[PDB]
Each structure stands twice: as structure tokens, then as C-alpha cells.
Amino acid sequence: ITGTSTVGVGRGVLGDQKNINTTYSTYYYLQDNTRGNGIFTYDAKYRTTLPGSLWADADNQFFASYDAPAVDAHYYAGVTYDYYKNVHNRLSYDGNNAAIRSSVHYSQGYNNAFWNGSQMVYGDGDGQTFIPLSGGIDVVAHELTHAVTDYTAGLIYQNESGAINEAISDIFGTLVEFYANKNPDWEIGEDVYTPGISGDSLRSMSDPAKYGDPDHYSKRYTGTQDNGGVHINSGIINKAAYLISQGGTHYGVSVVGIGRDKLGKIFYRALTQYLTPTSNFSQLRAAAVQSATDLYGSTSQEVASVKQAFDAVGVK
Ligand SMILES: c1cnc2c(c1)ccc1cccnc12
Ligand SMILES: c1cnc2c(c1)ccc1cccnc12
Ligand SMILES: c1cnc2c(c1)ccc1cccnc12
Ligand SMILES: c1cnc2c(c1)ccc1cccnc12
Ligand SMILES: c1cnc2c(c1)ccc1cccnc12
Ligand SMILES: c1cnc2c(c1)ccc1cccnc12
Ligand SMILES: [Ca+2]
Ligand SMILES: [Ca+2]
Structure with missing residues (x-):
């Protein structure tokens, strides 16, 4: 969405506080304009229709338990983008600053995360085998790396x-x-x-x-x-x-x-x-x-x- 770059705050899946790059236009969206063509995080609302709705909060504050997976998918996508750019001189997964899109709350109690060919998708886990899978920086980077592989060696x-x-x-x-x-x-x-x-x-x-x-x-x-x-x-x-x-x-x-x-x-x-x-x-x-x-x-x-x-x- 068109708007101005801002900095929100919220809490990730493990309860840790972090700053997130957002975009203000009436609401504050999980849209990070600081990295390539942007990082965008969406709510799948416990359904399997993708991507769902661009994630918004009225106050730029992301501390609801419902927010936690969205905060970590958004923030760890930014870390991953920083790793490829700073370490390997690679601009996003395609080498041309492709927008990084993530959906959280995919399905009900889904013990998985994946790259679907276009975007990242995270389950919330069943609460026993898994908690929301965006909580793991290695999980986030693992899935985005499938995107890097698909666009390179294939x-x-x-x-x-x-x-x-x-x-x-x-x-x-x-x-x-x-x-x-x-x-x-x-x-x-x-x-x-x-x-x-x-x-x-x-x-x-x-x-x-x-x-x-x-x-x-x-x-x-x-x-x-x-x-x-x-x-x-x-x-x-x-x-x-x-x-x-x-x-x-x-x-x-x-x-x-x-x-x-x-x-x-x-x-x-x-x-x-x-x-x-x-x-x-x-x-x-x-x-x-x-x-x-x-x-x-x-x-x-x-x-x-x-x-x-x-x-x-x-x-x-
Ligand atoms: C709209 C608003 N802010 C931005 C852009 C577009 C593009 C790049 C960028 C980089 C750093 C900070 N803000 C922006
Ligand atoms: C630090 C901690 N809690 C808060 C704030 C700052 C600001 C607003 C707010 C609104 C409701 C509940 N907690 C807070
Ligand atoms: C630091 C800053 N803001 C917050 C917290 C901690 C914790 C809860 C909260 C709830 C609403 C608004 N802001 C905050
Ligand atoms: C696509 C979408 N949702 C699912 C699967 C595949 C596979 C298993 C599963 C288990 C619990 C909840 N959703 C799913
Ligand atoms: C999910 C996945 N890919 C996309 C979107 C949502 C939205 C826009 C868009 C534009 C170009 C390429 N992919 C996407
Ligand atoms: C079957 C056959 N050869 C092996 C193993 C299993 C496992 C380890 C190993 C190491 C050196 C040489 N052969 C083997
Ligand atoms: Ca464990
Ligand atoms: Ca690890």
C-alpha cells in the first residue's frame, strides 16, 4: 500500500520485544519499505486461502498474542534479506529485490511452514508438536532459502x-x-x-x-x-x-x-x-x-x- 515508512513495536512468539518496519495509511501495516521491493506480512485468519489480508494495527503496536507469529515472520524475513544482501551481495530471493510475502495463521493447528512458489506460509502448530513456526529464525530462513534455490540451481x-x-x-x-x-x-x-x-x-x-x-x-x-x-x-x-x-x-x-x-x-x-x-x-x-x-x-x-x-x- 502507498503511505509513509514508520517503526512499530511488538512481541514475537517467544515473548521477546522487537521493532518492526511498518507503513502508515489510516492503519499501520506490516509492510517494510526499507528492504528491496518491500517485506509484506499477511493474516490467513485460520483458513487456507492465500495470501489473506495485509496485516494492520490501528496504533503501530503488535503485542496481542494473535500478533506474535506476524511480528516474527515480518522481522525474521528482514533478517534473512539482510543476510543474503550483506553476506552474499544477493538482493532478495530472485537477486532483483523481489517483494517478500508471508502469510501467518494458515489453517487450524497446522504443524508446518512452506514456500508455496510465490510466498512463505506459516502454521500456528497444534501447541504440542509445534508453536507458531515463524518463531524460529532458522525455520524462516530455511523456507526463504527454498525460494533462493528455486530461482538458482532449481x-x-x-x-x-x-x-x-x-x-x-x-x-x-x-x-x-x-x-x-x-x-x-x-x-x-x-x-x-x-x-x-x-x-x-x-x-x-x-x-x-x-x-x-x-x-x-x-x-x-x-x-x-x-x-x-x-x-x-x-x-x-x-x-x-x-x-x-x-x-x-x-x-x-x-x-x-x-x-x-x-x-x-x-x-x-x-x-x-x-x-x-x-x-x-x-x-x-x-x-x-x-x-x-x-x-x-x-x-x-x-x-x-x-x-x-x-x-x-x-x-x-
Ligand atoms: C515509500 C516510502 N518509504 C520508502 C519507500 C517507498 C521506498 C524505499 C524506502 C527505503 C527506506 C525508507 N523508506 C522507503
Ligand atoms: C508500555 C507498556 N504498555 C503500554 C504502553 C507502553 C503504551 C500503551 C499501552 C496501551 C495499553 C496497554 N499497554 C500499553
Ligand atoms: C513495551 C512497549 N509497549 C508495550 C509493551 C512493552 C507491552 C504491552 C503493550 C500493550 C499495548 C501497547 N504497548 C505495549
Ligand atoms: C494444506 C492445508 N492445511 C493442512 C494441510 C495441507 C495438511 C495437513 C494439515 C493438518 C492440520 C491443519 N491443516 C493441514
Ligand atoms: C502473494 C504472493 N505473491 C504476490 C502477492 C501476494 C501480491 C502481489 C504480488 C505482486 C507480484 C508478485 N507476487 C505478488
Ligand atoms: C554400510 C557399509 N559400509 C559402511 C557403513 C555402512 C557405514 C559407515 C562406513 C564407514 C566406512 C566404511 N564403510 C562404512
Ligand atoms: Ca522442544
Ligand atoms: Ca537452530
Whole structure:
């Protein structure tokens, strides 16, 4: 909507106070004009018709419990936009400042969040398995990263390309969590998964097997469930990225860590310059090694650590 840029305040899903970029025109809208072609957040009103109505408050104050998911979808979309722009010189998900649109309160008790091809969509969770899924900065960045993938490599959401698609979302979700720097970790979804059980999460990148996900190619799921295990086999690639960043010994293979920034630079380069819709795990190995060479040289530690990490998870 046309109006003047303002700054509201409200509380997120975890009860934390934050400032939000709004637009005033009779009401104050969750429309952030400070970032590209804007960030817009909508109310789906417990229905599945999208996007619903642009989010408004009469007083620029967003402290109602009903507001909480809208505040976090809006604010964490802005963090994610800041990460891609400041770190990778990428302007929104398409590289041309596309408007970021999010809908919250999607359906009734819906334990999921997704990129629908045009926008982000967040359930409120059933209150037991999940609380409103926009409460997790890694969840928000994971979903927006599907948009980045779809506009770049275009990795098909099935089998090994789909498992890489998921792993890129987990990797960049985790690097955005670290960029915001609010008690970051290598787990996925800890802020919104099983509210009343301490220190569990959807997935672990440091120890995928902690939640039954494979951490070696030999252990990969080959059946048809989960589009050929896109959320399962992601563990193999998540473990490789963890090892590249943080180092370790895994099935007796030792990896010297090169840190999060170089992990991000290498996988960002692989995603945007080398991966294709049909890339399999071995092709990801090749893309990452080349990305590391491009950036650091063919005899660099950085290239050595990428090779070590893929060897450790049995990906040649
Ligand atoms: C209308 C109102 N405010 C804005 C725009 C359009 C566009 C960009 C922008 C950047 C920073 C702050 N305000 C605006
Ligand atoms: C700090 C804390 N609570 C408030 C304000 C500022 C301003 C207005 C208001 C209106 C109703 C309830 N609480 C507040
Ligand atoms: C800081 C600032 N404003 C507020 C709060 C805290 C808490 C509640 C509230 C309710 C209505 C209006 N403003 C506030
Ligand atoms: C589209 C829309 N809503 C849903 C689904 C898909 C799948 C499951 C589900 C469970 C509870 C509430 N809504 C949904
Ligand atoms: C949901 C999803 N995409 C959109 C909107 C709402 C509204 C406007 C618009 C304009 C260009 C591209 N996409 C959208
Ligand atoms: C089946 C077969 N070989 C393996 C595994 C599972 C798991 C790990 C491993 C590590 C080194 C060599 N082989 C294997
Ligand atoms: Ca996390
Ligand atoms: Ca929990």
C-alpha cells in the first residue's frame, strides 16, 4: 500500500520485544519499505486461502498474542534479506529485490511452514508438536532459502537433488541463525518444536542420527516416502557441511574446520554457479570442490577440508 515508512513495536512468539518496519495509511501495516521491493506480512485468519489480508494495527503496536507469529515472520524475513544482501551481495530471493510475502495463521493447528512458489506460509502448530513456526529464525530462513534455490540451481524436490535442496535450506537457515547471533546452534527448529520438551529439535546437522537421520551415504533411504527421503538423506549433506565448518572425525575420517563464513561462501557459490536441477550428491561434491578452488586455490586447505568432509560421509 502507498503511505509513509514508520517503526512499530511488538512481541514475537517467544515473548521477546522487537521493532518492526511498518507503513502508515489510516492503519499501520506490516509492510517494510526499507528492504528491496518491500517485506509484506499477511493474516490467513485460520483458513487456507492465500495470501489473506495485509496485516494492520490501528496504533503501530503488535503485542496481542494473535500478533506474535506476524511480528516474527515480518522481522525474521528482514533478517534473512539482510543476510543474503550483506553476506552474499544477493538482493532478495530472485537477486532483483523481489517483494517478500508471508502469510501467518494458515489453517487450524497446522504443524508446518512452506514456500508455496510465490510466498512463505506459516502454521500456528497444534501447541504440542509445534508453536507458531515463524518463531524460529532458522525455520524462516530455511523456507526463504527454498525460494533462493528455486530461482538458482532449481534442484528438483525428489531423491538426491531434493535432499541437497533440503540441506541447502538447513545450512543457510543455520547460517542466518548465526548471523542474527541469538544463542545460535546446528539444530533445526529448536525454538518452535515440542514446546514442553527441553533441548530436542526437528533435525541436527552436528549429529543427524540423534533424530534417526543418516550421517553416511551407505545408510541413505532409497524408498518412496518423503519424496525419496528429501528430509532424511539431507542428514548426509548437513553432516558434511557441519564438518567443513566446525571440523571433526567421522567414521575415522578427520576434517579440519574452515569456519561458517567459508562454508557459506563455498555452498553459496556452488548453489548459484554449479548446481543444476538434477545434481546428485557426487555432483554436489564436485560443485563444492570447484567452488572452493575458485575461491581459495586448488591446493588450499579449504579444498582439502571439502574433500575430507565428503569422504567422511561416503560421497565420492
Ligand atoms: C515509500 C516510502 N518509504 C520508502 C519507500 C517507498 C521506498 C524505499 C524506502 C527505503 C527506506 C525508507 N523508506 C522507503
Ligand atoms: C508500555 C507498556 N504498555 C503500554 C504502553 C507502553 C503504551 C500503551 C499501552 C496501551 C495499553 C496497554 N499497554 C500499553
Ligand atoms: C513495551 C512497549 N509497549 C508495550 C509493551 C512493552 C507491552 C504491552 C503493550 C500493550 C499495548 C501497547 N504497548 C505495549
Ligand atoms: C494444506 C492445508 N492445511 C493442512 C494441510 C495441507 C495438511 C495437513 C494439515 C493438518 C492440520 C491443519 N491443516 C493441514
Ligand atoms: C502473494 C504472493 N505473491 C504476490 C502477492 C501476494 C501480491 C502481489 C504480488 C505482486 C507480484 C508478485 N507476487 C505478488
Ligand atoms: C554400510 C557399509 N559400509 C559402511 C557403513 C555402512 C557405514 C559407515 C562406513 C564407514 C566406512 C566404511 N564403510 C562404512
Ligand atoms: Ca537452530
Ligand atoms: Ca522442544
